[PDB]
Amino acid sequence: TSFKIAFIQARWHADIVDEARKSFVAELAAKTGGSVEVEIFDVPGAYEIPLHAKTLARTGRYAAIVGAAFVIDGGIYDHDFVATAVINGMMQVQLETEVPVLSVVLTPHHFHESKEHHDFFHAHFKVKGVEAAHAALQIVSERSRIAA
Amino acid sequence: TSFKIAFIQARWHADIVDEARKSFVAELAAKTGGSVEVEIFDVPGAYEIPLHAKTLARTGRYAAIVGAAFVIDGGIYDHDFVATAVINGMMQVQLETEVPVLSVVLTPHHFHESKEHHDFFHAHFKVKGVEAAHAALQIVSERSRIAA
Amino acid sequence: SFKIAFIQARWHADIVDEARKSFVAELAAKTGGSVEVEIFDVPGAYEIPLHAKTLARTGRYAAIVGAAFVIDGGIYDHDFVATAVINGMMQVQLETEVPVLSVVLTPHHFHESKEHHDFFHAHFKVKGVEAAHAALQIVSERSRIA
Amino acid sequence: TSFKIAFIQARWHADIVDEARKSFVAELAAKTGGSVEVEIFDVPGAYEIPLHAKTLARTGRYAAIVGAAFVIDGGIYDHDFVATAVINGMMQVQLETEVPVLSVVLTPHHFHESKEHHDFFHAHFKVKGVEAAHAALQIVSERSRIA
Amino acid sequence: TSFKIAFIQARWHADIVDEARKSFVAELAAKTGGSVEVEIFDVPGAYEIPLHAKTLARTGRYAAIVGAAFVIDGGIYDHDFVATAVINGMMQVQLETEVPVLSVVLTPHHFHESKEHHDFFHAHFKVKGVEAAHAALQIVSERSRI
Numbered sequence: 001t002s003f004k005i006a007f008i009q010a011r012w013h014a015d016i017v018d019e020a021r022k023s024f025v026a027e028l029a030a031k032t033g034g035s036v037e038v039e040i041f042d043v044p045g046a047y048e049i050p051l052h053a054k055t056l057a058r059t060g061r062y063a064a065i066v067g068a069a070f071v072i073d074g075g076i077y078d079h080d081f082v083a084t085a086v087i088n089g090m091m092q093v094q095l096e097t098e099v100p101v102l103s104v105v106l107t108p109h110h111f112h113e114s115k116e117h118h119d120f121f122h123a124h125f126k127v128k129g130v131e132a133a134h135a136a137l138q139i140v141s142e143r144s145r146i147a148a
Numbered sequence: 149t150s151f152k153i154a155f156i157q158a159r160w161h162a163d164i165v166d167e168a169r170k171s172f173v174a175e176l177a178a179k180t181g182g183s184v185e186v187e188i189f190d191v192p193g194a195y196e197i198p199l200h201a202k203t204l205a206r207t208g209r210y211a212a213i214v215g216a217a218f219v220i221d222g223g224i225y226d227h228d229f230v231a232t233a234v235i236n237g238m239m240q241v242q243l244e245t246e247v248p249v250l251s252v253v254l255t256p257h258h259f260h261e262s263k264e265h266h267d268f269f270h271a272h273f274k275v276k277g278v279e280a281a282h283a284a285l286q287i288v289s290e291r292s293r294i295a296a
Numbered sequence: 297s298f299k300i301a302f303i304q305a306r307w308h309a310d311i312v313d314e315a316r317k318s319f320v321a322e323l324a325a326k327t328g329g330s331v332e333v334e335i336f337d338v339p340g341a342y343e344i345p346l347h348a349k350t351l352a353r354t355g356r357y358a359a360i361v362g363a364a365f366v367i368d369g370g371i372y373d374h375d376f377v378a379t380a381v382i383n384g385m386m387q388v389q390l391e392t393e394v395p396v397l398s399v400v401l402t403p404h405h406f407h408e409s410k411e412h413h414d415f416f417h418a419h420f421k422v423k424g425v426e427a428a429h430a431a432l433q434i435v436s437e438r439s440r441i442a
Numbered sequence: 443t444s445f446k447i448a449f450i451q452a453r454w455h456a457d458i459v460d461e462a463r464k465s466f467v468a469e470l471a472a473k474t475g476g477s478v479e480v481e482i483f484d485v486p487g488a489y490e491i492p493l494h495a496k497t498l499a500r501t502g503r504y505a506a507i508v509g510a511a512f513v514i515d516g517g518i519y520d521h522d523f524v525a526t527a528v529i530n531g532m533m534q535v536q537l538e539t540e541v542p543v544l545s546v547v548l549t550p551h552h553f554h555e556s557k558e559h560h561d562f563f564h565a566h567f568k569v570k571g572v573e574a575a576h577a578a579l580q581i582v583s584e585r586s587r588i589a
Numbered sequence: 590t591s592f593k594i595a596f597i598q599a600r601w602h603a604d605i606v607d608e609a610r611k612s613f614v615a616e617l618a619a620k621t622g623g624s625v626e627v628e629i630f631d632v633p634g635a636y637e638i639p640l641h642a643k644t645l646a647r648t649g650r651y652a653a654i655v656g657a658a659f660v661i662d663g664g665i666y667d668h669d670f671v672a673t674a675v676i677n678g679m680m681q682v683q684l685e686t687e688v689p690v691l692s693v694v695l696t697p698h699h700f701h702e703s704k705e706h707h708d709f710f711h712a713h714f715k716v717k718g719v720e721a722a723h724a725a726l727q728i729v730s731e732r733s734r735i
Contacts, residue, residue, distance in 0.1 A: 078672070139196055402519065
């Protein structure tokens with residue numbers, strides 16, 4: 001099984017999001033040896049992920065795309081508007097291009113800084129990165145059956 | 149009569165989602181004898197369901213598709229964004245392909261683990277599986293009356 | 297002289313029925329019978345948008361009505377469906393250009409008993425009459441600006 | 443500085459919505475003399491506004507469309523679903539037909555009747571009607587400059 | 590590199606929004622010398638931003654578009670409906686025209702006037718303006734690579 005995966009990661013709070021990418025790339029290598037290679041693409045924020053996924057999806061080069069970002073909802077500013085536009089936009093792109101788009105765009109409830117939490121979120125994203133790899137593998141596999 | 153149904157089930161919490169598939173298949177068999185056959189498709193999570201339904205729908209092979217997942221909203225992480233993208237997504241796929249997509253993608257309010265609840269949710273999903281079979285049958289039948 | 301497709305969900309049929317009954321009657325009173333209504337049953341609210349689109353695509357109807365009772369509240373979040381449906385109906389009408397009227401009602405968190413049951417039956421009877429006046433009015437208004 | 447505007451007003455609570463239309467038409471008259479004429483169209487409720495706007499927009503006759511309605515959210519019944527379909531629907535229509543659609547579809551938080559409030563809302567809508575006219579003029583003008 | 594950016598600012602509360610445009614233009618000049626020029630467009634409210642973005646995007650002239658508005662959610666009137674149509678609308682536009690659209694459409698939680706807050710919001714918008722500039726540059730660059 002040989003295919004490429006585009007992983008789009010937002011850079012706001014890159015220290016957290018990076019945990020997921022590292023985790024994701026690792027597991028993928030463990031589980032496939034290296035016959036599945038992952039190309040990384042940086043993007044300013046979550047809001048730039050959908051158009052980037054659509055562009056990349058359109059190239060025909062990837063079997064799946066992952067968009068990861070940490071969207072901290074809460075503070076003086078309402079941020080859920082963005083999270084909604086982004087998760088919905090990703091759904092829209094995959095329905096339109098027919099390339100699976102997996103989401104590692106996490107939105108905590110109203111977390112609130114400190115080595116207390118910082119370690120919580122770093123742990124959590126490491127986990128979600130592993131899960132993401134398992135899903136990516138599984139959905140690619142499953143689609144190539146379902147269409148044969 | 150005779151036609152096929154694709155049943156897409158998400159694997160996160162499979163132990164609960166399974167109850168719905170079992171019950172759905174069963175009732176379908178009882179009520180039709182066997183003239184309506186159900187093909188099962190696995191998928192990592194809820195978010196993977198819309199594109200899978202669109203791909204399966206576009207094959208012409210099914211009179212109806214059922215998407216079933218358990219989306220536990222609540223915890224440190226906001227999970228409603230995904231439930232929304234998925235329930236809206238399924239709606240969008242059926243409108244675009246014109247193959248009915250029924251939902252058994254359930255989102256409890258903020259359930260909280262323990263043989264207490266676990267039996268509640270296993271029960272509820274078994275029921276929703278039966279209702280879903282009656283719904284599937286009734287909608288396919290009703291559409292073929294309109295249509296012609 | 298024209299047809300109206302009335303799509304009614306069957307979950308809680310006892311309540312939705314009030315609306316249809318009411319709708320049909322008023323429609324007969326106000327027009328005589330030159331506007332006929334065809335009824336379509338559907339398992340739940342979620343089945344209404346595709347049904348509306350299919351019917352709207354036939355060219356037979358001047359307007360479609362989707363009626364259902366979507367009880368939001370309980371251990372399960374139900375607003376996701378209410379949302380997909382009301383939005384879906386808007387989407388259908390924008391795409392097909394046949395008016396779709398909504399009698400898809402979502403109470404706040406009603407809670408059973410002859411107390412409420414009579415409340416909701418009354419309310420749906422009213423909404424059904426309003427719905428008929430609306431259907432007549434919009435069909436009429438569109439044929440002018442058309 | 444001479445064009446037409448379609449004003450779509452919902453009739454539920456017409457007593458309130460009407461304030462907005464009156465005010466809108468007046469200000470438009472004052473600020474333009476009369477070279478900008480407004481055609482009014484009635485519609486049952488807010489839910490009927492997007493398809494009407496699409497139809498009217500697609501005629502080519504109007505430089506802008508205004509949908510106005512009062513959507514009372516709150517009571518035993520959840521009403522926000524409709525407000526969302528409508529405000530989103532108007533956005534969709536303008537994106538698709540490229541004729542500006544301005545919103546005077548107002549949703550108070552959970553107002554609660556009485557000469558107390560009735561005068562509040564009548565006032566507010568008269569205000570939003572004026573603002574709407576300024577907006578209308580400004581956006582039509584701005585578009586004809588840039589593309 | 591050398592390309593143009595359309596900056597669409599809403600005029601309601603212009604005193605605050607302006608802070609962001611000022612800041613955005615500056616940082617862009619600082620960081621690029623002047624090889625990247627910004628064209629400003631005024632619009633009544635936030636709700637007028639997506640169509641404007643779409644029209645400007647369709648001209649071919651711009652590498653990116655920025656929409657900036659202050660949407661004060663809260664008061665007797667629900668305002669989130671608009672915020673939602675606008676941010677979703679901008680996302681839609683960029684998906685359809687494929688010209689990046691950046692958002693500086695901010696909605697505070699329920700701020701409440703006074704030199705106390707006024708300076709808070711003016712400060713915050715100045716900051717988001719700088720960030721927007723860095724984002725604009727970065728996404729234009731990154732797209733021309735892929």
